[PDB]
Design a protein around this ligand. Structure first.
Ligand code: MG
Length: 353
């Protein structure tokens, strides 16, 4: 199979439908990775460099190096940039949720004091968002304002994930994150609520009702980010379609934000020990899946503005961690259309045609 830079550009192929993006790390902006990026994509997102704890690890202490390098890459290569992410319950500094006495706010029992912690947390969120937006508003083309605020089950009637943000502020942190993002980014900035398993119920319906409710109260939400951490047979093409159509019906835009097609089910066990151990049947099944997937994206391209892969080539993917985690430290997945050596896979040909 030829190298990725010897085949037709994915970005050019879908230029009339949607952007083609990739999650990157500061150290993958040169060499073959950089070459592949410039050749196939017209959009990028920080895999980790822009999460909360990565920008303000200590209150008032901002670390912009990683993010600036990614932003600089985007500028020089004229690529769009998704910002991931302003709010999340993971990879977020503990100081956010500590009261003025240094005790975790979730422990406070005085109603009035809890009310005071809510306002303090929100003020801190406002400051984080404002600081970040002011620095990157001219480079960001899409913001993952909040990330995974919806639960996979139904712990509460609204299906909201009961993270530390919810425990301390209910749904206000979501309202504030969006309202603040709009304030400092401008009316033209596209604000998204990102999440995984947006194709399955009840989660899909919980997210749906959430955006409706918020939109009714004037909260500025422009689109839904579909992480799309999917499998070869799940979710079904129809589940994907139905979900995107529902949000499109509300006037919201859609974006596939962290796409990877695992060769395994869940959990990813048993997984193949190495890449060479993977039989061709697997790559062919993945190929048929990618074809169906991108035909769908194309069909719905009026309500889909961007499709980002959570990685570039099979040599670097968080799916390998999940694989090792469930196969006693050994396991290899292969979610992309480019292999560990940056050579095209059967899936590439099925989505370039
Ligand atoms: Mg095809």
């Amino acid at each position: 199979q030829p190298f990725a830079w010897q085949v037709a550009s994915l970005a050019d192929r879908y230029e009339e439908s949607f952007d083609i993006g990739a999650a990157v790390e500061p150290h993958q902006l040169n060499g073959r990775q950089g070459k592949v990026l410039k050749h196939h994509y017209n959009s990028i997102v920080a895999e980790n460099a822009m999460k909360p704890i990565s920008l303000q690890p200590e209150e008032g202490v901002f670390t912009w190096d990683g993010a600036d390098a990614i932003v600089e890459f985007a500028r020089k290569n004229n690529m769009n940039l998704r910002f991931h992410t302003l709010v999340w319950h993971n990879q977020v500094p503990d100081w956010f949720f500590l009261d003025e006495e240094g005790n975790p706010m979730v422990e406070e029992t005085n109603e009035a004091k809890r009310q005071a912690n809510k306002e303090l947390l929100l003020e801190r969120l406002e400051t984080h968002i404002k600081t970040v937006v002011e620095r990157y508003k001219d480079d960001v083309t899409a913001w993952d304002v909040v990330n995974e605020v919806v639960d996979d089950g139904t712990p509460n009637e609204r299906g909201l994930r009961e993270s530390v943000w919810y425990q301390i502020t209910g749904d206000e942190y979501i309202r504030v994150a969006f309202e603040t993002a709009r304030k400092y980014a401008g009316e033209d900035a596209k604000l998204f609520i990102n999440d995984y398993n947006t194709e399955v119920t009840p989660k899909r319906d919980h997210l749906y009702n959430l955006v409706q409710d918020l939109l009714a109260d004037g909260v500025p939400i422009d689109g839904v980010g579909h992480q799309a951490h999917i499998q070869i047979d799940w979710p079904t093409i129809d589940e994907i379609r139905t979900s995107m159509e529902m949000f499109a019906g509300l006037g919201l835009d859609n974006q596939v934000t962290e796409l990877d097609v695992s060769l395994y089910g869940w959990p990813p066990r048993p997984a193949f020990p190495t890449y060479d151990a993977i039989p061709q049947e697997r790559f062919q099944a993945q190929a048929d899946r990618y074809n169906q997937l991108f035909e769908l994206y194309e069909e719905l391209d009026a309500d889909l503005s961007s499709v980002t892969f959570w990685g570039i080539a099979d040599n670097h993917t968080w799916l390998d961690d999940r694989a090792r985690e469930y196969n006693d430290g050994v396991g290899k997945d292969a979610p992309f259309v480019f292999d560990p050596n940056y050579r095209v896979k059967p899936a590439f040909w099925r989505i370039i045609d």
